[PDB]
Structures are given as structure tokens and as C-alpha cells.
Amino acid sequence: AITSKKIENFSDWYTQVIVKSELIEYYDISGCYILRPAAYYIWECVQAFFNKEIKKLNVENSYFPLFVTKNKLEKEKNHIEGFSPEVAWVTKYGDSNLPEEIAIRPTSETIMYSVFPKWIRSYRDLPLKLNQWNTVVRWEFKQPTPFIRTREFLWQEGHTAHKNEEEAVKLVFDILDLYRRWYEEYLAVPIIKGIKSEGEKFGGANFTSTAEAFISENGRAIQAATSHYLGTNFAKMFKIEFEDENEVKQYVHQTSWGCTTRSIGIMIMTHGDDKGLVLPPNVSKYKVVIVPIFDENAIHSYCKDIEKILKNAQINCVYDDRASYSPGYKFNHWELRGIPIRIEVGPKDLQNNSCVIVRRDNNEKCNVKKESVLLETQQMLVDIHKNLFLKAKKKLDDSIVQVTSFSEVMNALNKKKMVLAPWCEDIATEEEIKKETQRLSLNETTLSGAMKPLCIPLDQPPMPPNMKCFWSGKPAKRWCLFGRSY
Amino acid sequence: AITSKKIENFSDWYTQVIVKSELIEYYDISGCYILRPAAYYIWECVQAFFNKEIKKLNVENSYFPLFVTKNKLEKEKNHIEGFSPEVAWVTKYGDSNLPEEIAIRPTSETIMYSVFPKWIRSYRDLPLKLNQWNTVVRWEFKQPTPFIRTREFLWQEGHTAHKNEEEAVKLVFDILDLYRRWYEEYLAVPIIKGIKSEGEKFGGANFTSTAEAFISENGRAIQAATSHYLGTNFAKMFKIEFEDENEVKQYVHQTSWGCTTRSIGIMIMTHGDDKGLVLPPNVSKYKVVIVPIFDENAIHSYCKDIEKILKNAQINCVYDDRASYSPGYKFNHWELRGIPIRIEVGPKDLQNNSCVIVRRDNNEKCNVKKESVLLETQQMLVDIHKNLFLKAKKKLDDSIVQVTSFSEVMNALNKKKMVLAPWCEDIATEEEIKKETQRLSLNETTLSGAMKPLCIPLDQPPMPPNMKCFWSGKPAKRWCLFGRSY
Ligand SMILES: Cc1cc(N2CC[C@@](C#N)(C3CC3)C2=O)cc(NC(=O)Cc2ccccc2)n1
Ligand SMILES: Cc1cc(N2CC[C@@](C#N)(C3CC3)C2=O)cc(NC(=O)Cc2ccccc2)n1
Numbered sequence A, B: 001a002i003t004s005k006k007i008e009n010f011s012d013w014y015t016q017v018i019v020k021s022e023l024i025e026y027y028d029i030s031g032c033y034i035l036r037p038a039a040y041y042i043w044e045c046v047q048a049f050f051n052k053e054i055k056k057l058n059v060e061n062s063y064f065p066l067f068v069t070k071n072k073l074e075k076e077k078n079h080i081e082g083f084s085p086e087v088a089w090v091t092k093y094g095d096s097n098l099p100e101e102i103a104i105r106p107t108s109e110t111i112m113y114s115v116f117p118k119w120i121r122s123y124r125d126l127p128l129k130l131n132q133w134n135t136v137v138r139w140e141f142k143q144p145t146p147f148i149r150t151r152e153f154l155w156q157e158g159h160t161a162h163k164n165e166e167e168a169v170k171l172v173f174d175i176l177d178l179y180r181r182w183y184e185e186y187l188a189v190p191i192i193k194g195i196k197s198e199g200e201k202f203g204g205a206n207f208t209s210t211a212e213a214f215i216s217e218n219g220r221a222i223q224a225a226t227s228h229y230l231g232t233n234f235a236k237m238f239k240i241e242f243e244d245e246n247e248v249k250q251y252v253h254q255t256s257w258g259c260t261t262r263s264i265g266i267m268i269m270t271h272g273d274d275k276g277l278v279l280p281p282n283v284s285k286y287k288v289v290i291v292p293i294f295d296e297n298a299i300h301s302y303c304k305d306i307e308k309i310l311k312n313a314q315i316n317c318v319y320d321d322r323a324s325y326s327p328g329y330k331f332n333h334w335e336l337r338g339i340p341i342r343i344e345v346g347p348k349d350l351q352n353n354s355c356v357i358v359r360r361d362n363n364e365k366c367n368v369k370k371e372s373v374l375l376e377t378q379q380m381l382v383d384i385h386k387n388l389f390l391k392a393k394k395k396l397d398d399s400i401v402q403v404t405s406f407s408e409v410m411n412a413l414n415k416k417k418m419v420l421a422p423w424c425e426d427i428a429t430e431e432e433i434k435k436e437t438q439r440l441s442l443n444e445t446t447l448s449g450a451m452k453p454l455c456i457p458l459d460q461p462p463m464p465p466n467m468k469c470f471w472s473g474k475p476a477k478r479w480c481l482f483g484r485s486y
Helices: A010-020 A038-057 A069-072 A079-084 A107-114 A167-188 A233-238 A262-271 A297-313 A327-336 A347-351 A372-400 A405-414 A425-439 B012-019 B037-056 B069-075 B078-086 B109-113 B165-186 B235-238 B262-273 B297-312 B327-336 B347-351 B370-398 B406-414 B427-440
Strands: A086-091 A096-106 A127-137 A152-162 A192-195 A207-215 A220-231 A241-243 A249-251 A253-260 A288-292 A317-319 A341-345 A354-359 A365-369 A401-404 A417-424 A452-457 A478-483 B086-092 B096-104 B128-137 B152-162 B191-195 B207-215 B221-233 B241-243 B250-252 B253-260 B288-292 B317-319 B340-346 B354-358 B365-369 B398-401 B419-421 B452-457 B479-481
Touching: A010 A107, A010 A262, A038 A152, A069 A096, A069 A107, A107 A233, A107 A253, A127 B152, A152 A167, A152 B207, A167 A207, A167 A220, A167 A253, A167 A262, A192 A354, A192 A372, A192 B037, A207 A262, A207 A452, A220 A233, A220 A262, A220 A478, A233 A253, A233 B096, A241 B207, A249 B479, A253 A262, A253 A425, A262 A372, A288 A327, A297 A317, A297 A347, A297 B262, A297 B347, A341 A347, A341 A372, A347 A354, A354 A372, A365 A372, A401 A452, A405 A417, A405 A425, A417 A452, A452 B207, B012 B262, B037 B152, B037 B165, B037 B262, B069 B096, B069 B109, B078 B109, B109 B152, B109 B370, B152 B165, B165 B207, B165 B221, B165 B253, B165 B262, B207 B262, B221 B235, B221 B262, B235 B253, B253 B262, B253 B327, B262 B370, B288 B297, B288 B327, B297 B317, B297 B340, B297 B347, B327 B340, B340 B370, B347 B354, B354 B370, B354 B398, B365 B370, B370 B398, B370 B452, B406 B419, B406 B427
Parallel strands: A288 A317, A288 A341, A401 A417, B288 B317, B288 B340, B398 B419
Antiparallel strands: A086 A096, A086 B086, A127 A152, A152 A253, A192 A207, A192 A452, A207 A220, A220 A253, A241 A249, A341 A354, A354 A365, A417 A478, A452 A478, B086 B096, B128 B152, B152 B253, B191 B207, B191 B452, B207 B221, B221 B253, B241 B250, B340 B354, B354 B365, B419 B479, B452 B479
16 A cells, blocks of 8 residues: 555655556666666657657657767867766776776767768758657766656657758747647646746757646646757857858757656656556556456456457456455555556446446546447546546646745745746846745755746746836846746 | 679678668767668667567566666676676766766666566566667677677667476577567568577576578678577576465576667678668668659659559658759669669650659569559569568578588688588587687688587487587587688
């Protein structure tokens, strides 16, 4: 059983759920986690979706080396200043020192763009559109969180190069909406699109667009995915020039974008409850578990009939016919593992040519005739997804408090909210705001009390004529979301 | 153009083909290579096939960490003795030394089996069946070869644990036949199944079964895939015990198996010719390229009609309508890249409601009426695969010389053959044979002249009553394939 309540001890709840549902195994290197089959299956689902969608944009998958030389790694100025203390270095093979130490990729801009100039010489070579499915390493000494913040993680990283700004920026936002769909249609998680503040954008980017999620039970925002307009910054550093149709040398305009197995953690944190994992049907291997209750051969034959009915309509299920466990053990076993639907069959159900169908998300039960099971299961799978999404969306909406003064912020943070505030967007105020909110959090978590700029939402409320910045008192430019975060 | 002939300067031919066909880009770390989209597409095809097939055996995909501790890495005795001098070690993050240095996986037995004992406690937990799609690192200082022998490579590694020997061994050979199908049905490459000699089997294995391929143009064998029966050797080292139905503690019987992007290199070396890449249709993104020859709008409309006909029947193609290049440039451009079929359309073809269809593998051309194109393309794609396979199979068969005495070996090796020889299988003769054949190769390649035991073929000729070992003169046990190798 899960022995900590989600609302009472969130972190212990989370670790219990991910271990006991067999998603995650811990490892003897801190910040590294094993993805067991149930977790990797979710990854494969979203991988298939995203592959299908980026193929329509003519992005092609590729694979680049795990390692980068000092030479290539330092061509980036703001980029390496961002990543340098968490880049892991290989220095030895066996007991012998390498002739030159080499670094493991934290992200692959410097690796890929080292060869982009050979591939791009003319406007005819554009656009160039690549993606990798790989793992990267960011070896930090902050507290890790399984799925959410790890030292090694699986992701996809896309990289494109275009003849001008307009085409690149359009691709940036097309990708951002694909991430919206990845979260909503497969994980049933709502996100907020926005632009990062200057202090929080990717090193080397012109701007960083972002999808933000929020975990209302512990008041913490989590960046769900990211899509950068790099402009010509990397093209200047790596000399990625092309001859345009007027025979003029130009720099390419670049994008890069990423989304990780953090998405799985966001889904777990969003939908999981005190009984364990709750899976949206689109990322659940088994849509239905059939559990018999005890003639035992009549029940066996009936449950296998139902299994045939579901599998014949391409609905994968499992009939838990294990002889040594009670029905209630099985109920709990499969609720912990997040199976969306349980079908129960006892003798009274068989006599009625009926069965009991039980939704994982709200535990509502109903009697369904045998011949109606297929249809009723299909409808229910759809309705479960919608319910999960809508419940999460209400929580997301209820997590935002609009403020005009810093005097309202701490109260909102302590109620596990984010704030939407008018802001002048000056980069120095970012650190000032972080430090003051951290200082004032003195009035249970292990994570920091500091509030960060999360994103400037694409959907802006009107800015009244003379509204001042909630922090500096200077004229406010736009509304920006702030909160504590992972 | 390819400027070296396959038969005259094989290595320069190979490097030209893989670069100019845009499969591979070289990198500023030796032995590491970029897989450009055309190469990665082949990987994705065989990945999809193998996933589908291992799912039928109830193998589940997973993902384990890139890194392993000294602790876990040394529990293996023969395994670490095998891998230790080519294990790469991470010792630093940024400029700070790690508190404990950690190793990059050369293969994941020690990583996965460190946690197997927590997952396997009862006969109810068996069999356990896992697979990973990942990359591994084997940092050797021998000469690398793109695709064939690299310091980092993509692969799949499967690992299973069973209640007894019979079940494990059956899975070993089921996997070996899946590798046979991977090579034959997608890459059109024939292989030879066999068992490794004791000197060549995997460190820690009970036995190693193998699929061997042979490149007749330079006389070199290449191991195509591998499937190990590990017995209880790793179970003893990692204490993977389970309670059986008689309540007796037993060790699991384990398997592990692997197949890499080396398969792509084998395909290139097998089917490539003096014009460049030759792709089996099942791993070619474009099955057909349509090339116009010059009313230009009539030809454009006709070629697009044909493109619609092919794409409507789920046959991906490309219409090369680029205005600045001649037809012959385009012919060569797409032959270099291995497209299986070229359709040419000039005015005489349009007047005849016809077109010219040209096979990449033998350059045979024929006139096909418009309404017959779909059908004729389908048949031709099938026939191209069969032809590629059968041609390769003839070469493989012609590459084996049966000998009874060492006196016949060097002659055969110099004619770019392998030898099938009666052998006593004593492990010390392996090094003796290697050293003597290397010594005698004195009478152009950069690779070693040494001959190795390749495999003991599953399909054995009869062993005559008193046949002696071709090397030691002692009684021969079985026939074994020997040759030079990659
Ligand atoms: C699993 C995961 C994800 C992500 N990040 C980042 C932003 C981003 C987004 N959106 C990426 C661009 C795509 C994301 O998902 C980041 C991470 N580790 C780290 O920062 C390193 C680390 C390790 C231990 C403790 C603290 C920090 N770990
Ligand atoms: C691309 C590839 C493949 C394979 N091997 C091995 C046997 C096997 C088979 N069958 C694996 C078990 C599955 C295979 O494919 C091995 C390798 N590198 C190496 O030995 C390291 C190396 C690096 C530079 C020069 C020389 C050697 N590189």
C-alpha cells in the first residue's frame, strides 16, 4: 500500500508510487534511475507520436557522438558559460590516461554545429532539419528527483537551420504546439505557453519559448518542454554561412528544441492519487484488467471470452487468473500500476450475462451486459482521458493568482500558488526577486523557497496605461508568471 | 564520382561510398562517426522489425544508466578481464574531480544484474525478459572502421533470466534466428550460424552462438550478431537466486544478445558497387526516383501523375524536378544514394504513354505503360531484394574452401577465402594458429593477416572416423570455419 498521502507528504508519496508501481528502480549512482518496462512504454508512446508529427515538418532523425572535444565545446561563449561546471569529462581508458580528455554531451549544439558548415554552403541546402533521440548528462550536485531532475536523461533534441528569421520562428512555435499536444493528448496534462525571461533563457538563444506545467499539491512549477530561436548566435560562433540567391553570404537562423522523460514525471505528479499510479489510456500497455471472483471453469471461460472480445478490437488487456491471490489483492495490484479499467466477473455477474466495470480515475462502478462491453469500454477509455485532463486543467487554472504588488506575493506562494504580475522585465530584478522570496520563506520541503520568473505567457491580459512593475515600481512592460519551481 | 573500384582499392572505395552517399560524416574524435539521416533510417527500419519480433517473445524494452561503479563492474571476473582496458572512465565534472570515478558501459550485464536480485525472488518472477536500445562505448586503439568497428555504437542488447537451462537455450537460438531474419529480409545479407570457440566466446558466457558474414571482395569475415547462453555464471557472481516450486534455492539461467549498426556496414560492403550505394528496398526511404528529361509542363504533369500513383499505394518516392541540374547529373546523384528504382520520362515516353524504369542493382532498363507502372514497380522491388540476396549468397558459398591440412590454408587465405577445417578445438591452438598465419602472411591491407576461429557451424558435415585435427594432428572433434576478420 501507499502509506503517505499525496496532500500530506508529497515527496514520500511520489517515491513510494514510482517504486511500488514498478516504474523506477533506484541505482547506486545518485541522480541516475532505471526506467523499468512500464515507464519505458510511456516513453515509446510519446516517441511514436512525436516522430510522426515532426516527419510532417520534414525533420529527419540522426545520431551524433556522445563525446565532444574541448575545442568544439568552447566555441560557444554564453552556452559553455551556462553548462561548464556540470559537463562530465572522460579522462581514462582502463588505467591509462586519454591523450586528450573528452566531454560527455549535456546537449548537442556544439557537436552538431561543428559539422553544419560542411553541409550548408548554398541557399539550396536550406532548411536543414535534424532530430536525435538520445541521452544527455548534466552532472549537477543539487537534489535530484526521479524523472523530473536527473543527471542522465532520455530526450529528443531537434535542431534546424533556415534562410531567414521568419521561417525559423514559425518552426519554433510549430514545435511548441507539438509539445502542447504531446502533453495534452497523450499525458492529459495542460501546459502554459510563454517566453522565458532574459535571465532564464537558454545560453546562446535569441529567445526561449516554453511550455510550463504546475504541480498544485506542492505548489511547484516544472518546465515541460522548450523551443529556442537561436537566431544567428550559433551561426556566428561556428561560422555557418551560406550564399543566398543574390550571391550574398548570410548566417543561417537556427532553432533547437527538447523534451525529456520529465514529461512522465509530470504526468505521474498530475494524475497520481493515494492508491498509486493513474495512467491516461494512450500510454497504458494494458487498457483493461479482468479479475475473476470465485464452478471456476465457467468464470474462466467467461473472462477469456471478454479478453477475446477486447483483443479482437485491438484493445490490449490482461486477465489476472493467478490462483494464489485473492480478488482484492488483484484489485490493488492493478490499481497501483495505473490500469485505467478493471472488469470484475463473479458468479452473480455470469448469471446476469453481465460484468462490473470500474474506472481507475474516480472508482465509479457499473454493470454492463456482455454484448455491450466492447462499446462501453471504448467510450469509457475516451471519457477517462477527458476527465483526467479537465480535472488537471481546473487545478492549473486555480493555481494562478493575479497580483499588482509584491505585498501579495508571499501569501500566494504559501498557498501553493503561482503569481501573474506586471513586470518591467529588467534582468537584475530576477536575482533580486529570487533572493527576497527565499529570504521570506522562513515562515517543510527540502527544495528552495525562491520564486523565479517562469514565463511571460503568450496569452497576455491588457496592461493598464500606467501600471507599474510589482517589484521595481518602474513602468511595467508585460504580465509574467512567477513561482517556486523544480 | 566514386574514384576507386571496389575490387581494386576496397578501403578507399568504402570510405568514398559512405561519405559521398551521405550515410556518414567523420568527426574530430577518431573512431566516432555521425549517422546522417540516410543511415539512421536504416537503423529505424531494423529497429521496428526487431521490436515487433521480440515483443512476440514477451521481451520488454527498458533503459538502464550509462554509468557503472567500480563496485558493480568488478563482480564480473572473466567479463571484466575481457573489457577492462577499453572501459572509459569519467573522473571530473567541470574542473572538479568526481568523489568517485565512474565508468561508461561497454555492455550492460553488470549494470542490469546489479538489481536483478531484487526483481527475482521466486519461480513466479520468471522468466524475466528485457531489452535496451542504447549506445555503448569500447575505447580501443586498434584501427576503427565506420559502421564495422567503432568506439561508440548504437545497438540493442537483450537480457533474459529463466528457471532452467532448456528454456534459456531455446531463447538463445530463437534470437539467433531473428538475427538471421534481420539480415536476410531487410538487409538481403546471408549469414552462417555457429558456435564460437572457447577462445572467442563472450567473457562469462557458457557458450556464444553467432551469425557470421563474409566480405568476399577483401576476404574478411565479420561477426554480424551474437547470442550468449550465460548459464549460471553471472547469477553466481551477482547472487541472482530464486526459490523454486520445491522451495529450493536455484540460480537463474541467463541469456544476453546483441546486434549493432555494424549490420548497416555489412549491407554496404555486401551490395555496394562502383557507382556507390545499393539499398535493399526495405531499408530505403525512397523506393523510386522520377527524373524528367526535356513543353516542360506536360512532362511535369506526367511525372507528378506517376508520383501520385506510387504514393497513393504507400510507395514513397521523390520527383527530382530541380531545374539547374541535367538528367545525367540526377541519374548519378540518386544511383550514388542507392535508390532501388529510377523512372525516366522524356517526350518520346510521354507520346507513347510510357516511361523507362531502371533497376539500381543490374542497370536493366525497360519500357512500361503508365497504367502498368504501379504493378511493375511492386514486382520489381521484390525482385531486386531477391536478386541482391541470391547474388550475395552465391558469393558467400564460393568463399568457403574445405581443407584437411594446414598445408592448404595460406593459399586459400590469399585467394580471399575462409577455410572449413577439422579441428580438435583445444583453446591453446587458437593463439598458435593466429600467430602462424600472421607470420606467413608476409608473402597491401592495413589489417592483420592473422586467421581466427570464426564459428563452429551449426550445420556440420560428417566427421570421418579417424580424421585428425588440421593443426595439432590429434583426433578432430568438429569442422570449424577459420579466416581473417574485422
Ligand atoms: C529529466 C531532466 C530534465 C531537465 N530539463 C532541463 C530543462 C528541460 C526542459 N523543458 C530540457 C531542455 C529540455 C528539461 O526537461 C533537466 C534535468 N537535469 C538537470 O537539470 C541536471 C540536474 C541533476 C540533478 C539535480 C539537479 C539538476 N533532468
Ligand atoms: C560497431 C561495432 C560493433 C562491434 N561488435 C563486437 C561484437 C558484436 C557482434 N556481433 C557485438 C556483440 C554485439 C559487434 O557488433 C564492436 C565495435 N567496436 C569495438 O569492438 C571497439 C573498437 C573500436 C575501435 C577499433 C577497434 C575496436 N563496434
